[PDB]
Coordinates of N, CA and C in Angstrom, one line a residue:
Chain P
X1 N 1.0 -1.1 -0.1 CA -0.1 0.1 -0.5 C 0.6 1.2 -0.3
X2 N 1.7 2.0 0.8 CA 2.8 3.3 1.5 C 3.2 2.6 1.9
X3 N 4.2 1.3 2.1 CA 5.3 0.3 2.7 C 6.5 0.2 1.3
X4 N 5.6 -0.3 0.4 CA 6.9 0.0 -1.3 C 7.0 1.4 -0.8
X5 N 6.1 2.1 -1.2 CA 6.9 4.0 -1.5 C 7.3 4.8 -0.2
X6 N 7.2 3.5 1.1 CA 8.1 4.2 2.5 C 9.6 3.5 2.0
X7 N 9.5 2.7 1.5 CA 10.9 1.6 1.4 C 11.9 2.2 0.4
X8 N 11.2 2.6 -0.9 CA 12.1 3.4 -1.9 C 12.0 4.8 -1.2
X9 N 11.5 5.3 -0.2 CA 11.9 6.6 0.5 C 13.2 6.8 0.5
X10 N 13.0 5.1 1.5 CA 14.5 5.6 2.4 C 15.9 4.7 1.7
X11 N 15.0 4.0 1.0 CA 16.3 4.0 -0.2 C 17.2 5.5 -1.3
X12 N 16.2 6.3 -1.6 CA 16.5 7.7 -2.2 C 16.9 8.0 -1.1
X13 N 16.3 8.6 0.2 CA 16.9 9.7 2.3 C 18.2 8.4 1.5
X14 N 18.6 7.4 1.6 CA 20.3 6.7 1.9 C 21.4 6.8 0.6
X15 N 20.4 7.1 -0.2 CA 21.0 7.9 -1.6 C 21.5 8.7 -1.8
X16 N 20.9 9.8 -1.2 CA 20.6 11.5 -1.3 C 22.3 11.3 -0.4
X17 N 22.0 10.8 0.9 CA 22.8 11.0 2.1 C 24.7 10.3 1.7
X18 N 24.0 9.6 1.0 CA 25.5 8.9 0.8 C 26.7 10.3 -0.4
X19 N 25.4 11.0 -1.7 CA 26.1 11.6 -2.4 C 26.3 13.1 -1.8
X20 N 25.6 13.4 -0.3 CA 25.8 14.9 0.4 C 27.7 14.5 0.5
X21 N 27.4 12.9 1.4 CA 28.9 12.8 2.0 C 29.9 13.0 1.0
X22 N 30.0 12.4 -0.4 CA 31.1 12.5 -1.7 C 31.2 14.0 -1.9
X23 N 30.4 14.5 -1.1 CA 30.5 15.8 -1.7 C 30.8 16.5 -0.5
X24 N 30.7 16.0 -0.1 CA 31.4 17.4 1.5 C 30.8 18.3 2.0
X25 N 29.4 18.2 1.1 CA 27.7 19.1 2.1 C 27.4 18.7 3.1
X26 N 27.6 19.6 4.0 CA 26.5 19.1 5.3 C 25.2 20.1 5.0
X27 N 24.3 19.2 5.2 CA 22.8 18.7 5.0 C 22.1 19.9 5.4
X28 N 22.4 19.7 7.4 CA 22.3 20.3 8.2 C 22.7 22.0 8.2
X29 N 23.2 22.0 7.5 CA 24.5 23.6 8.6 C 23.7 24.8 8.5
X30 N 22.7 24.5 7.6 CA 21.2 25.9 7.8 C 20.5 25.7 8.6
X31 N 20.4 25.0 9.0 CA 19.6 24.5 10.1 C 19.5 24.9 11.1
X32 N 21.6 24.1 12.3 CA 21.9 24.4 12.4 C 21.8 26.1 13.0
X33 N 22.7 26.7 12.0 CA 22.7 28.5 11.7 C 21.9 29.1 12.5
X34 N 20.4 28.2 11.9 CA 19.0 28.9 12.1 C 18.7 28.8 13.7
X35 N 19.0 28.0 14.4 CA 18.7 27.4 16.3 C 19.7 28.3 16.5
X36 N 21.5 29.3 16.2 CA 22.3 29.7 17.3 C 21.5 31.2 17.6
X37 N 21.0 31.2 15.7 CA 20.4 32.5 15.7 C 19.3 32.4 16.1
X38 N 18.5 31.7 16.9 CA 17.1 31.7 17.1 C 16.9 31.8 18.6
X39 N 18.4 31.6 18.5 CA 18.8 31.8 20.6 C 19.8 33.4 21.3
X40 N 20.2 34.2 19.9 CA 21.2 35.1 20.1 C 19.6 36.2 20.5
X41 N 18.3 35.5 19.0 CA 17.7 36.4 18.6 C 16.1 36.4 20.7
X42 N 16.6 35.1 21.5 CA 15.9 35.1 22.6 C 16.5 36.4 23.1
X43 N 18.2 36.1 23.4 CA 18.6 36.9 24.3 C 18.7 38.6 24.1
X44 N 18.6 38.8 23.2 CA 18.2 40.0 23.1 C 16.9 40.6 23.0
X45 N 16.2 39.5 22.6 CA 14.5 40.1 22.7 C 14.3 40.2 24.8
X46 N 15.2 38.9 25.4 CA 14.7 39.3 26.8 C 15.3 40.5 27.1
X47 N 17.0 41.2 26.7 CA 17.7 42.8 27.3 C 17.4 43.5 27.0
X48 N 16.2 43.6 25.6 CA 14.7 44.4 25.6 C 13.6 43.6 26.4
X49 N 13.1 43.6 26.8 CA 11.2 42.6 27.6 C 12.3 43.9 28.8
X50 N 13.7 43.4 29.6 CA 14.0 44.0 30.0 C 13.8 45.1 30.7
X51 N 14.6 45.8 29.7 CA 14.6 47.6 29.4 C 13.0 47.4 29.4
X52 N 12.0 47.8 28.9 CA 10.5 47.5 29.1 C 10.0 48.1 30.3
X53 N 10.8 46.3 31.2 CA 9.5 46.4 32.3 C 10.6 48.0 33.1
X54 N 11.3 47.6 33.4 CA 12.2 49.1 34.0 C 11.8 50.4 34.1
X55 N 11.3 50.3 32.8 CA 11.8 51.9 31.6 C 9.8 51.8 31.7
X56 N 9.3 51.3 31.6 CA 7.9 51.2 30.9 C 8.2 51.8 29.8
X57 N 7.1 51.4 28.4 CA 6.8 51.0 27.4 C 6.3 53.0 26.6
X58 N 6.1 53.8 27.9 CA 5.6 55.4 27.3 C 6.9 55.9 26.9
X59 N 7.8 55.5 28.4 CA 9.0 56.4 28.4 C 10.5 55.2 26.9
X60 N 10.4 53.8 27.1 CA 11.1 52.9 26.0 C 10.3 54.2 24.8
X61 N 9.5 54.3 24.2 CA 8.1 54.5 22.5 C 8.6 55.9 22.7
Chain F
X1 N 26.2 15.8 -7.9 CA 25.4 17.2 -7.5 C 23.6 17.3 -7.9
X2 N 23.7 16.8 -9.2 CA 22.6 16.6 -10.0 C 21.9 15.5 -9.6
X3 N 22.7 14.4 -9.6 CA 21.8 13.4 -8.6 C 21.4 13.3 -7.8
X4 N 22.2 14.6 -6.9 CA 21.5 14.3 -5.6 C 20.5 15.9 -5.6
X5 N 20.2 16.6 -6.2 CA 19.3 17.6 -7.1 C 18.4 16.7 -7.1
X6 N 17.8 16.0 -8.3 CA 16.4 15.2 -8.2 C 16.7 14.1 -7.0
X7 N 17.2 13.7 -6.5 CA 16.5 12.7 -5.4 C 16.3 13.6 -4.1
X8 N 16.0 14.9 -4.2 CA 16.2 16.0 -3.2 C 14.4 16.5 -3.7
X9 N 14.4 17.1 -5.0 CA 13.2 16.8 -5.5 C 11.8 15.6 -5.4
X10 N 12.4 14.5 -5.8 CA 12.1 13.3 -5.4 C 10.8 13.0 -4.2
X11 N 11.9 13.4 -3.2 CA 11.6 13.3 -1.6 C 10.8 14.4 -0.9
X12 N 11.3 15.2 -1.9 CA 10.5 16.5 -1.4 C 10.7 17.5 -0.4
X13 N 12.4 17.8 -0.2 CA 13.6 18.1 0.3 C 13.8 19.4 0.2
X14 N 13.5 20.6 0.7 CA 14.2 21.6 0.9 C 15.4 22.2 0.6
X15 N 16.2 21.5 0.3 CA 17.9 21.3 0.7 C 17.9 22.9 1.7
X16 N 17.4 24.5 0.8 CA 17.8 25.2 1.4 C 17.3 25.7 2.5
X17 N 15.5 25.2 3.3 CA 15.0 25.4 3.8 C 15.3 26.1 5.3
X18 N 16.8 26.0 5.7 CA 18.0 25.9 6.8 C 18.1 26.8 7.1
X19 N 18.7 27.5 5.8 CA 20.5 28.7 5.1 C 18.9 30.1 5.2
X20 N 17.4 29.4 4.3 CA 16.2 30.5 4.9 C 16.4 31.0 5.9
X21 N 15.2 29.9 6.6 CA 15.6 30.3 7.9 C 16.2 31.3 8.6
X22 N 17.5 30.8 8.7 CA 18.7 32.0 9.0 C 18.7 33.0 8.9
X23 N 18.5 33.3 7.1 CA 18.4 34.9 7.3 C 17.3 35.3 7.9
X24 N 16.3 35.0 8.3 CA 15.2 35.9 8.3 C 15.3 35.8 9.9
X25 N 16.2 35.1 10.6 CA 16.2 35.8 12.3 C 17.9 36.2 12.2
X26 N 18.8 36.1 11.2 CA 20.3 37.2 11.4 C 19.0 38.8 11.2
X27 N 18.2 38.8 10.4 CA 17.6 40.1 10.5 C 16.9 40.4 10.8
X28 N 16.2 39.7 12.6 CA 15.5 39.5 13.4 C 16.1 40.0 14.7
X29 N 17.6 39.6 14.3 CA 18.9 39.7 15.4 C 19.0 40.9 15.0
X30 N 19.1 41.6 13.8 CA 19.1 43.2 13.2 C 18.4 43.9 14.1
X31 N 17.1 43.7 13.6 CA 16.4 44.6 14.0 C 16.2 44.8 16.0
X32 N 16.6 43.8 16.4 CA 16.6 43.9 18.0 C 17.9 44.4 18.1
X33 N 18.6 44.7 17.1 CA 20.6 44.8 18.2 C 20.1 46.6 18.4
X34 N 19.1 47.3 16.7 CA 19.0 48.0 16.1 C 18.8 48.4 18.1
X35 N 17.2 48.1 18.0 CA 16.5 49.0 19.6 C 17.5 48.6 20.7
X36 N 18.0 47.6 21.1 CA 19.6 47.5 22.0 C 20.2 49.0 21.8
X37 N 20.9 49.3 21.1 CA 21.2 50.1 20.2 C 21.0 51.5 20.6
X38 N 20.1 51.9 19.7 CA 19.0 53.0 20.2 C 19.2 53.4 21.3
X39 N 18.4 51.9 22.9 CA 18.0 53.4 23.9 C 19.4 53.0 24.6
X40 N 20.5 52.1 24.1 CA 22.0 52.5 25.2 C 22.2 53.8 24.2
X41 N 22.1 54.2 22.8 CA 22.4 55.6 22.4 C 21.9 56.9 23.8
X42 N 19.9 56.0 23.7 CA 19.4 57.3 24.9 C 19.9 57.2 26.3
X43 N 20.2 56.1 26.8 CA 20.1 55.4 28.3 C 21.6 56.2 28.8
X44 N 22.6 55.2 27.7 CA 24.1 55.1 27.9 C 24.3 53.8 29.1
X45 N 25.3 53.5 29.1 CA 26.0 52.4 29.3 C 25.5 52.3 30.4
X46 N 25.9 53.5 31.3 CA 25.7 53.2 33.4 C 24.6 53.1 33.8
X47 N 23.8 53.9 32.5 CA 22.3 53.8 33.4 C 21.6 52.3 32.9
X48 N 22.1 51.6 32.0 CA 21.6 50.8 31.6 C 22.2 49.3 32.1
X49 N 23.2 49.0 32.0 CA 23.9 48.5 32.6 C 23.2 48.9 34.7
Chain Z
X1 N -1.6 4.0 -6.2 CA -1.9 3.1 -6.7 C -1.2 3.2 -8.8
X2 N -1.4 4.4 -8.5 CA -0.1 4.0 -9.9 C 0.7 5.3 -9.8
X3 N -0.1 6.7 -8.6 CA 0.5 7.4 -9.1 C 2.1 7.4 -8.0
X4 N 2.6 6.5 -7.3 CA 3.6 6.3 -6.6 C 4.6 5.8 -7.3
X5 N 4.2 4.7 -9.4 CA 4.8 4.2 -9.7 C 5.2 5.5 -11.2
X6 N 4.7 6.4 -11.1 CA 4.9 8.1 -12.0 C 5.2 8.7 -11.5
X7 N 5.4 8.9 -10.0 CA 5.9 9.3 -9.7 C 7.8 9.2 -9.6
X8 N 7.8 8.0 -9.7 CA 9.0 6.8 -9.6 C 9.8 6.4 -10.9
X9 N 8.6 6.8 -12.1 CA 9.4 6.7 -13.0 C 9.8 8.5 -13.2
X10 N 9.4 9.1 -13.1 CA 10.0 10.5 -13.0 C 11.5 10.0 -12.3
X11 N 11.4 10.1 -11.3 CA 12.7 9.8 -10.6 C 13.8 9.2 -11.5
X12 N 13.3 8.1 -12.7 CA 14.8 7.4 -12.5 C 14.3 8.4 -14.4
Chain V
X1 N 30.8 2.2 -3.8 CA 30.5 1.2 -2.9 C 30.0 1.2 -2.2
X2 N 29.5 2.6 -1.3 CA 28.7 3.5 -0.4 C 27.4 3.0 -1.0
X3 N 26.5 3.6 -2.8 CA 25.9 3.0 -3.3 C 25.6 1.9 -3.5
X4 N 26.7 0.5 -3.6 CA 26.7 -0.5 -3.7 C 25.8 -1.2 -2.7
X5 N 26.0 -0.6 -1.1 CA 25.7 -1.0 0.1 C 24.2 -0.6 0.2
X6 N 24.3 0.0 0.0 CA 22.7 1.1 -0.1 C 21.2 -0.2 -1.2
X7 N 21.7 -0.2 -2.3 CA 21.0 -1.1 -2.9 C 21.2 -2.2 -2.3
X8 N 22.1 -3.2 -1.8 CA 22.1 -4.0 -0.7 C 21.5 -3.9 -0.3
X9 N 21.1 -3.3 0.8 CA 20.3 -3.1 2.0 C 18.7 -2.8 1.7
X10 N 18.3 -1.9 0.9 CA 16.6 -2.1 0.2 C 16.3 -3.2 -0.5
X11 N 17.9 -4.4 -1.3 CA 17.2 -5.7 -1.6 C 17.0 -6.8 -0.9
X12 N 17.9 -6.5 0.6 CA 17.8 -7.4 2.0 C 18.8 -8.5 1.2
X13 N 20.2 -8.1 0.8 CA 20.9 -9.0 -0.2 C 22.6 -8.7 1.4
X14 N 22.1 -10.5 1.7 CA 23.5 -10.7 2.8 C 24.5 -10.8 2.2
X15 N 25.4 -9.8 0.7 CA 26.7 -9.8 0.8 C 27.6 -10.9 1.6
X16 N 27.7 -10.5 2.4 CA 28.5 -11.4 3.3 C 28.2 -12.8 2.9
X17 N 27.3 -13.4 2.8 CA 26.2 -15.0 3.1 C 27.6 -15.5 3.0
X18 N 27.9 -15.6 2.0 CA 28.6 -16.8 1.4 C 30.3 -16.9 1.7
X19 N 30.9 -15.9 2.3 CA 31.7 -15.7 3.0 C 31.9 -16.5 4.2
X20 N 30.9 -15.6 4.9 CA 30.2 -16.6 6.0 C 30.3 -18.1 6.2
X21 N 29.3 -18.6 4.5 CA 29.5 -20.2 5.5 C 30.5 -20.2 5.0
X22 N 31.4 -20.4 4.0 CA 32.5 -20.5 4.0 C 33.9 -21.0 4.7
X23 N 33.0 -20.3 5.7 CA 34.1 -19.9 7.1 C 33.8 -20.8 7.7
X24 N 32.2 -21.3 8.3 CA 31.8 -22.2 8.7 C 32.1 -23.8 8.2
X25 N 32.2 -23.9 7.0 CA 32.7 -24.9 6.6 C 34.0 -25.7 6.3
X26 N 34.6 -24.4 5.9 CA 36.3 -24.0 6.5 C 36.9 -25.1 8.1
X27 N 36.1 -25.1 8.9 CA 36.1 -24.8 10.3 C 35.5 -26.8 10.4
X28 N 34.5 -27.4 9.6 CA 34.0 -28.3 9.4 C 35.1 -29.2 8.6
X29 N 36.1 -28.9 7.9 CA 36.7 -29.1 7.5 C 37.7 -29.7 7.8
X30 N 38.3 -29.0 8.6 CA 39.8 -29.4 9.8 C 39.3 -29.9 11.4
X31 N 38.1 -30.1 11.6 CA 37.6 -30.4 12.3 C 37.4 -31.9 12.0
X32 N 37.1 -32.3 10.7 CA 37.1 -33.6 10.3 C 38.6 -34.4 9.6
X33 N 40.0 -33.1 9.4 CA 40.6 -33.6 8.6 C 41.8 -34.1 10.6
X34 N 41.1 -33.4 11.3 CA 41.7 -33.8 12.8 C 41.3 -35.2 13.6
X35 N 40.1 -35.6 12.7 CA 40.2 -37.2 13.1 C 40.6 -37.9 12.0
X36 N 40.8 -37.5 11.0 CA 41.7 -38.4 9.8 C 42.8 -38.7 9.9
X37 N 43.5 -37.9 10.5 CA 44.7 -37.6 11.1 C 44.8 -38.3 12.3
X38 N 44.5 -38.2 12.8 CA 44.8 -38.9 14.6 C 44.3 -40.4 14.3
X39 N 43.6 -40.9 13.6 CA 43.6 -42.3 13.2 C 44.8 -42.3 12.2
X40 N 45.1 -41.9 11.6 CA 46.5 -42.4 10.9 C 47.4 -42.3 11.8
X41 N 47.4 -41.8 12.7 CA 48.5 -41.3 13.7 C 48.1 -42.8 14.8
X42 N 47.3 -42.7 14.6 CA 46.6 -45.1 16.0 C 46.7 -46.0 14.8
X43 N 46.8 -46.1 13.3 CA 46.6 -46.9 12.7 C 48.3 -46.7 11.8
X44 N 48.9 -46.0 11.7 CA 49.0 -45.3 10.3 C 49.0 -45.8 9.3
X45 N 49.7 -45.2 8.1 CA 49.3 -45.3 6.9 C 49.6 -46.1 6.5
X46 N 50.1 -47.3 6.2 CA 50.2 -48.7 5.4 C 48.7 -49.4 5.7
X47 N 48.4 -49.1 7.3 CA 47.0 -49.6 7.5 C 46.1 -49.4 7.0
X48 N 46.1 -48.0 7.2 CA 44.6 -46.9 6.3 C 44.4 -47.8 5.0
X49 N 45.7 -46.9 4.3 CA 45.6 -47.4 3.1 C 45.4 -48.7 2.5

């Protein structure tokens, strides 16, 4: 039913991985950079949130 | 590279999805850093710290 | 049904 | 080699099945040859032949 297409996608994924390794392509490089920046955003947003809690919106705006 | 692309397309794998998300967040960082920089220029480091 | 074999022939 | 391995796994082909069977039989040969060698040492060639 869908087990045959599942098994074919497993093969295809494995072939893509082998080629990624031959090519020295880091497939996860972008998702890894993304998660570092998402942590930088949350750190900056905490600093801004803190200044808003100290000065208030009226003052900050 | 061409064989990897064909397989990526068969698998409906967006290879650039992560670099695309990264560049959106890098813009969010620069927008937040500008807001912080602005408050530092208005209050000064002594006050902000 | 035949969509899976169609998609495999596209890859091939 | 990596592509051949991936296909071997998709096909459920045990590539080493034959070398594995071979090494089991090579052990069976050495066990039988030891039994024969032992009987030759006990009876001697003249008698065994």
